[PDB]
Amino acid sequence: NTLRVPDILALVIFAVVFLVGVLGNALVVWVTAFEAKRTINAIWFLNLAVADFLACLALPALFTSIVQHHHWPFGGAACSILPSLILLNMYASILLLATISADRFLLVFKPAWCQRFRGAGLAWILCAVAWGLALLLTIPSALYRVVREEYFPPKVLCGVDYSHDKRRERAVAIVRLVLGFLWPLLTLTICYTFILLRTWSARETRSTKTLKVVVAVVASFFIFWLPYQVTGIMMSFLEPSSPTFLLLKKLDSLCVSFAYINCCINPIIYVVAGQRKSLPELLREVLTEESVVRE
Amino acid sequence: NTLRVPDILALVIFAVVFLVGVLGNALVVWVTAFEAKRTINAIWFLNLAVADFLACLALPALFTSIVQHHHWPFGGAACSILPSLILLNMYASILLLATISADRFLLVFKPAWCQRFRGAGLAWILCAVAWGLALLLTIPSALYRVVREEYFPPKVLCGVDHDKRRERAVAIVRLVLGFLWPLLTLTICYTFILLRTWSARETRSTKTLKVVVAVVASFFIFWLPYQVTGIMMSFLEPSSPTFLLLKKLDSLCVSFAYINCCINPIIYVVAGQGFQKSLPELLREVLTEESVVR
Ligand SMILES: CCCCn1c(-c2ccccc2)nc(-c2ccccc2)c1CN(Cc1ccc2c(c1)OCO2)Cc1ccc2c(c1)OCO2
Ligand SMILES: CCCCn1c(-c2ccccc2)nc(-c2ccccc2)c1CN(Cc1ccc2c(c1)OCO2)Cc1ccc2c(c1)OCO2
Ligand SMILES: CCCCCCCC/C=C\CCCCCCCC(=O)O
Ligand SMILES: CCCCCCCC/C=C\CCCCCCCC(=O)O
Ligand SMILES: CCCCCCCC/C=C\CCCCCCCC(=O)O
Ligand SMILES: CCCCCCCC/C=C\CCCCCCCC(=O)O
Ligand SMILES: CCCCCCCC/C=C\CCCCCCCC(=O)O
Ligand SMILES: CCCCCCCC/C=C\CCCCCCCC(=O)O
Ligand SMILES: CCCCCCCC/C=C\CCCCCCCC(=O)O
Ligand SMILES: CCCCCCCC/C=C\CCCCCCCC(=O)O
Numbered sequence: 001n002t003l004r005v006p007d008i009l010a011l012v013i014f015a016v017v018f019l020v021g022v023l024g025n026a027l028v029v030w031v032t033a034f035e036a037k038r039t040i041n042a043i044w045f046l047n048l049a050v051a052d053f054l055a056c057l058a059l060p061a062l063f064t065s066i067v068q069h070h071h072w073p074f075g076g077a078a079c080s081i082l083p084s085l086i087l088l089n090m091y092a093s094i095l096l097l098a099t100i101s102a103d104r105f106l107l108v109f110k111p112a113w114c115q116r117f118r119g120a121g122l123a124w125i126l127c128a129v130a131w132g133l134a135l136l137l138t139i140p141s142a143l144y145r146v147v148r149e150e151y152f153p154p155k156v157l158c159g160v161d162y163s164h165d166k167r168r169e170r171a172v173a174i175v176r177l178v179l180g181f182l183w184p185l186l187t188l189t190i191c192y193t194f195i196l197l198r199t200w201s202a203r204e205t206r207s208t209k210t211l212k213v214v215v216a217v218v219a220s221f222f223i224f225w226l227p228y229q230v231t232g233i234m235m236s237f238l239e240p241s242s243p244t245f246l247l248l249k250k251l252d253s254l255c256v257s258f259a260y261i262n263c264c265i266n267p268i269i270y271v272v273a274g275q276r277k278s279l280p281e282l283l284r285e286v287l288t289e290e291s292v293v294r295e
Numbered sequence: 296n297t298l299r300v301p302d303i304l305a306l307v308i309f310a311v312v313f314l315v316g317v318l319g320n321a322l323v324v325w326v327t328a329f330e331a332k333r334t335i336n337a338i339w340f341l342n343l344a345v346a347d348f349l350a351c352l353a354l355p356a357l358f359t360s361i362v363q364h365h366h367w368p369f370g371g372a373a374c375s376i377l378p379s380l381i382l383l384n385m386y387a388s389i390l391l392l393a394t395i396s397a398d399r400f401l402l403v404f405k406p407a408w409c410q411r412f413r414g415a416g417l418a419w420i421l422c423a424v425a426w427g428l429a430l431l432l433t434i435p436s437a438l439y440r441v442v443r444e445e446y447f448p449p450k451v452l453c454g455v456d457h458d459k460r461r462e463r464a465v466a467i468v469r470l471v472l473g474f475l476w477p478l479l480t481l482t483i484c485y486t487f488i489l490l491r492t493w494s495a496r497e498t499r500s501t502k503t504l505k506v507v508v509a510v511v512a513s514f515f516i517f518w519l520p521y522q523v524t525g526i527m528m529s530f531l532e533p534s535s536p537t538f539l540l541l542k543k544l545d546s547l548c549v550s551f552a553y554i555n556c557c558i559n560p561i562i563y564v565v566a567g568q569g570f571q572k573s574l575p576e577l578l579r580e581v582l583t584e585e586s587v588v589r
Contacts, residue, residue, distance in 0.1 A: 143464060146458070164438065
């Protein structure tokens with residue numbers, strides 16, 4: 001009859017993430033757009049903002065579906081596109097964050113390279129490549145979701161359809177777990193280990209506000225993606241009949257909801273980092289630092 | 296009983312491609328491997344040759360199957376792997392050709408960037424990414440492939456695993472990712488490059504560029520009939536006579552696509568004679584050219 005507590009909590013988090021995410025990320029795009037033609041950091045934060053904004057658009061449909069006990073009245077096109085937006089957000093944000101991390105690394109260890117080659121056009125090219133690879137990785141996820149009808153009780157479910165549930169679905173879970181979480185975790189941990197050791201050690205090299213901001217965003221990625229990944233592979237290695245599988249499936253909306261916090265956490269981090277100046281001005285200072293002075 | 300004309304033609308093409316492909320690409324690997332440590336072009340051509348060599352390994356099985364009227368005696372594992380090696384060849388080849396085209400572009404338009412960043416380790420990293428992405432693209436096709444028993448007459452068939460509406464979109468995604476998008480992008484790329492090398496005397500059209508342009512053209516030339524017949528069959532009814540005709544022509548299309556796995560050495564030898572020596576010597580001059588002197 002009435003909704004379960006985890007689903008309710010997922011609805012609350014969904015609402016908050018929708019408001020803060022849509023308005024906040026839109027404000028970020030507005031602030032960074034004018035400075036995006038020259039400043040590199042502005043290009044980074046701009047792309048992260050667009051990626052977070054697109055995922056928020058799918059929220060009202062997921063909300064309506066959860067209120068209707070996972071009923072899906074939006075059709076097959078929405079079934080293929082709307083759920084996939086956050087997976088697209090996952091790959092796009094982690095790719096852009098990898099590029100930004102390479103930027104922060106090179107600024108610290110190879111200033112000479114950055115003085116000669118760190119231009120806006122290269123940044124836009126790398127961002128375009130990131131979006132391309134992200135969409136490429138998200139395509140199978142869009143193709144293989146279908147709308148199915150059930151009768152006990154009657155309901156219309158939007159879900160993944162793989163006849164080889166044991167063989168192929170586990171492969172999807174493995175690919176997502178590795179490309180989306182484990183590999184980025186390893187490489188970025190090594191990267192910021194190097195960077196932070198050098199920053200703490202040498203007085204001549206400073207910790208810029210941009211570095212602290214990027215570190216907070218990178219941490220937030222893994223923090224809010226962890227439960228969805230863990231439960232996600234766990235539901236590939238479990239029998240459907242098993243009680244553990246039942247529990248995790250009853251927690252699914254809550255995990256997706258926790259993952260969606262990535263789409264609104266960035267404006268919070270930017271504002272907190274910025275703290276006699278207006279909010280857009282604060283964002284403009286935090287998100288448009290020049291790393292290489294030229295004029 | 297007797298095979299149809301297209302199937303015999305496919306057998307002949309598979310034979311020629313197996314011989315020229317295995318021996319030629321193996322020799323190209325032998326030529327480029329010693330220099331792949333330092334010169335980047337040798338890395339490109341080495342990865343290309345490996346990709347075209349792997350596809351030929353599955354050729355004898357496909358040959359044997361076509362001789363037996365498309366009966367499949369090799370089982371499910373071979374059914375999932377061997378037919379799809381040509382697909383892995385498709386994706387790996389077009390990805391490597393994409394990075395190579397980006398290299399030919401950067402050499403012409405960004406000499407200064409090439410001076411600092413065109414290193415062997417980066418080229419090997421990009422090759423690793425191309426191979427991994429190619430495998431990742433080939434996996435879903437392999438999983439859908441399956442053995443299928445039939446009784447009138449008895450026979451074992453290897454084939455794809457529904458939803459018409461979904462199957463159409465998947466076929467369109469294959470046509471775009473494997474052909475149309477690479478066609479558009481590479482066309483624009485070499486439009487800029489060739490227009491520049493033609494306009495400016497200071498800019499030279501190097502031997503490596505001519506070779507690479509030839510290979511890139513050969514890709515679309517040989518993959519075209521297969522892509523067209525596939526996208527056509529996905530949008531046609533089985534009851535349709537033209538569908539049946541395309542179904543008969545499938546082996547010939549696979550063979551003509553398989554020419555991609557043996558035409559590369561032919562191109563290298565033709566170009567090497569064209570500039571005007573032992574075969575390995577010619578291949579070494581053509582495939583190990585250094586674009587940045589140090
Ligand atoms: C600057 C981001 C690099 C992404 N990346 C990571 C990467 C690192 C940290 C976090 C996310 C990705 N590991 C490897 C890499 C892996 C093996 C060998 C060589 C390179 C790569 C190289 N990738 C190709 C690429 C090149 C240039 C790009 C690009 C992607 O977008 C922006 O400009 C391949 C790739 C792309 C996305 C991936 C991934 C691998 O695993 C996790 O998700
Ligand atoms: C230099 C290779 C470029 C591949 N590519 C093509 C490409 C071009 C011509 C031929 C083949 C691939 N179009 C786009 C691209 C697409 C949209 C926006 C920005 C870039 C891309 C960027 N891709 C990332 C990547 C892949 C493989 C790599 C790599 C980076 O460095 C090493 O090896 C994503 C990608 C990879 C394979 C694809 C594809 C997209 O669509 C068709 O097949
Ligand atoms: C899938 C949606 C991805 C959308 C992300 C891209 C956002 C579009 C906004 C701007 C892109 C075009 C900006 C190109 C500026 C190039 C000139 C320059 O800055 O040197
Ligand atoms: C799948 C792995 C996920 C776990 C996180 C990875 C654990 C290792 C992380 C960082 C170890 C890197 C230590 C590098 C030391 C640098 C030495 C120096 O800077 O002087
Ligand atoms: C119950 C789980 C909720 C946890 C919320 C986590 C929010 C993540 C936000 C920021 C992570 C910590 C930021 C640390 C900044 C590091 C700056 C520096 O190292 O100099
Ligand atoms: C909602 C359940 C999880 C709790 C999430 C809490 C969200 C906000 C909490 C902390 C935000 C931390 C922001 C850190 C900004 C670092 C600024 C700096 O660089 O100094
Ligand atoms: C997006 C999926 C891409 C697949 C991941 C790539 C898998 C390859 C992993 C490691 C290979 C790295 C080896 C290259 C190191 C350079 C060696 C050298 O300098 O000689
Ligand atoms: C998607 C379009 C791909 C075709 C463009 C060529 C691909 C080359 C890859 C990267 C080149 C980016 C540099 C472009 C600016 C220099 C070229 C110019 O100014 O004419
Ligand atoms: C007939 C096949 C369909 C058309 C395919 C298009 C292929 C065009 C590709 C490259 C052509 C480049 C255009 C400029 C050529 C200039 C040559 C020169 O002047 O040196
Ligand atoms: C140049 C490759 C770009 C994509 C071409 C694919 C379709 C064209 C196929 C065959 C036509 C040959 C076009 C090559 C023109 C070479 C002109 C020259 O170098 O003299």
